[PDB]
Design a protein around this ligand. Structure first.
Ligand SMILES: Nc1nc2c(ncn2[C@@H]2O[C@H](COP(=O)(O)OP(=O)(O)NP(=O)(O)O)[C@@H](O)[C@H]2O)c(=O)[nH]1
Ligand SMILES: [Ca+2]
Ligand SMILES: [Ca+2]
Ligand SMILES: [Mg+2]
Length: 166
């Protein structure tokens, strides 16, 4: 079947694994469990087509930035996640996008900017500023909550569609 190599990237703690676990396993990891590198392969039906999601869940850890070039090379589409209650993760997310473009020698690589944790009250990143960043890059912006599942399928399936229409 058609396969989509998705990579989830972003600062530590933004909810990369929670987004993936919510998508693939229909539940929210309310727990501390840092990722090194994790891979999920789930066969889904998206707009009537059977396809294999091959999702690589990466580490936000401040080191491990050598293992990062290798999965950016192989990755087909990228979920670029920050948390709407963590301005630093937003500020850091431009650096991931830049590294994706450098490692893939392209600025037309399918990407979705994801503002996660949108259930929380103490938001520190306004949707308007996330909008501008996504617009400045030519990529959609989608807010998610891995806790309530809001926007989760939307974020991942839009990424698949960005790949399909690329
Ligand atoms: N309220 C809320 N908490 C969330 C959400 N997503 C993740 N969290 C919480 O935030 C923490 C970090 O989640 P996690 O998915 O492990 O983040 P990560 O980006 O995968 N971390 P790492 O880079 O270390 O692998 C956990 O306590 C998790 O339950 C969300 O959508 N809403
Ligand atoms: Ca290069
Ligand atoms: Ca181009
Ligand atoms: Mg994780």
């Amino acid at each position: 079947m058609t396969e989509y190599k998705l990579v989830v990237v972003g600062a530590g703690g933004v909810g990369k694994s929670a987004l993936t676990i919510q998508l693939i396993q229909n539940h929210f990891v309310d727990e501390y469990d840092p990722t090194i590198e994790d891979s999920y392969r789930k066969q889904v039906v998206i707009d009537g087509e059977t396809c294999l999601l091959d999702i690589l869940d990466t580490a936000g850890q401040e080191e491990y930035s050598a293992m990062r070039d290798q999965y950016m090379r192989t990755g087909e589409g990228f979920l670029c996640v920050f948390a709407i209650n963590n301005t630093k993760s937003f500020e850091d997310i431009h650096q991931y996008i830049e590294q994706i473009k450098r490692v893939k020698d392209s600025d037309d690589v399918p990407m979705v900017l994801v503002g996660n944790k949108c259930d929380l009250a103490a938001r520190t990143v306004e949707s308007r500023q996330a909008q501008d960043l996504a617009r400045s890059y030519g990529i959609p912006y989608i807010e998610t909550s891995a806790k309530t599942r809001q926007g989760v399928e939307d974020a991942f399936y839009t990424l698949v569609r960005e790949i399909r229409q690329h």
